Design a protein around this ligand. Structure first.
Ligand code: 0W3
Lengths: 265, 11
């Protein structure tokens, strides 16, 4: 048991390291100035947007308004994350042995919760690492965005602050991320039971990880369990923004991958 | 289906 709980703890990390090119370790190293060899452009207004703008989003360009340029990098970066997460998922022991529809279902619902977990790794009190860390966008400048967008990230910065206070590392995050994916309470799952046996094994590997990797957080496990449901709030919040840009906000076509995902939830 | 996930799942 508790050697294969260590075994599975290591596998995940390896596969986490395989699938996710930007890690917290790198994100934290840059955020605290420890690689002054990777010192990031600061976007704090329309003005520095312009200069940082010049670093795919192709001739697909058209200098349109600030918010549509930001839409497009988000979109492109979401697409990549979906792919990484999926490739990571494919590597959770037993994940592939499940019915295809349910493997789809878990990704449909698991994907944004993990996008937002990972986002926290890129955030502190004042802003967010962007462009693979070669960029840093302020919280204050994300607030000056008009319309439905100016107060969207505010609840994500709160919570990115709260969740970073847990000092989780890449090896911690790996299992947390697999726990989320293997959750049997997603709408429309065909075979709940096999998923739960999988999640229970992961829940336990994690439990151990946390007692091992942080012996002086006493109740870290319980603190971390609760974030999973803050995550779903975060996500219904997300879903309800897409909603307003579905109707109002002409011109913002979702990527078809992101269409598949935001459709019937 | 969900066509893109699938292909990403298939390999
Ligand atoms: C860091 C971000 C800018 C970086 C960039 O311009 O490049 C902050 C960015 C404004 C985040 C939020 C969505 C925002 O205010 C969006 C916005 O006005 C436009 C008009 C509406 C939306 C695109 C509609 C569609 C999708 C977005 C909502 C969605 O994208 C984001 C909510 C969510 O995705 C958060 C972020 C952005 C995309 C991402 C998957 C990226 C970022 C880096 C990395 C590796 C992390 C996160 O894991 O993934 O997470």
């Amino acid at each position: 048991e508790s050697a294969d709980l260590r075994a599975l703890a290591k596998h995940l990390y390896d596969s986490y390291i395989k699938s996710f090119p930007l890690t917290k370790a790198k994100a934290r190293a840059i955020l605290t100035g420890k690689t002054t060899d990777k010192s990031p452009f600061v976007i704090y207004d329309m003005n520095s947007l312009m200069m940082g703008e010049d670093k795919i989003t192709p001739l697909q360009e058209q200098s349109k308004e600030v918010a549509i340029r930001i839409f497009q990098g988000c979109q492109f970066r979401s697409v990549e994350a979906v792919q990484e997460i999926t490739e990571y998922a494919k590597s959770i022991p037993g994940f592939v042995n499940l019915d295809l529809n349910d493997q789809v279902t878990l990704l449909k619902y698991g994907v944004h919760e993990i996008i937002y977990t990972m986002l926290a790794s890129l955030m502190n009190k004042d802003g967010v690492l962007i462009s693979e860390g070669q960029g840093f966008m302020t919280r204050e400048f994300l607030k000056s965005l008009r319309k439905p967008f100016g107060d969207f990230m505010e609840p994500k910065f709160e919570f990115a602050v709260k969740f970073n206070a847990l000092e989780l590392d890449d090896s911690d995050l790996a299992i947390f991320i697999a726990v989320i994916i293997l959750s049997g309470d997603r709408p429309g799952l065909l075979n709940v039971k096999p998923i739960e046996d999988i999640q229970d094994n992961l829940l336990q590997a994690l439990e151990l990880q946390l007692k091992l990797n942080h012996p002086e957080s006493s109740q870290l496990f319980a603190k971390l369990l609760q974030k999973m449901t803050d995550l779903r709030q975060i996500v219904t919040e997300h879903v309800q923004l897409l909603q307003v840009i579905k109707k109002t906000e002409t011109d913002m076509s979702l990527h078809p991958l992101l269409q598949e995902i935001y459709k019937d939830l | 289906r969900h066509k893109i996930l699938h292909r990403l799942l298939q390999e």
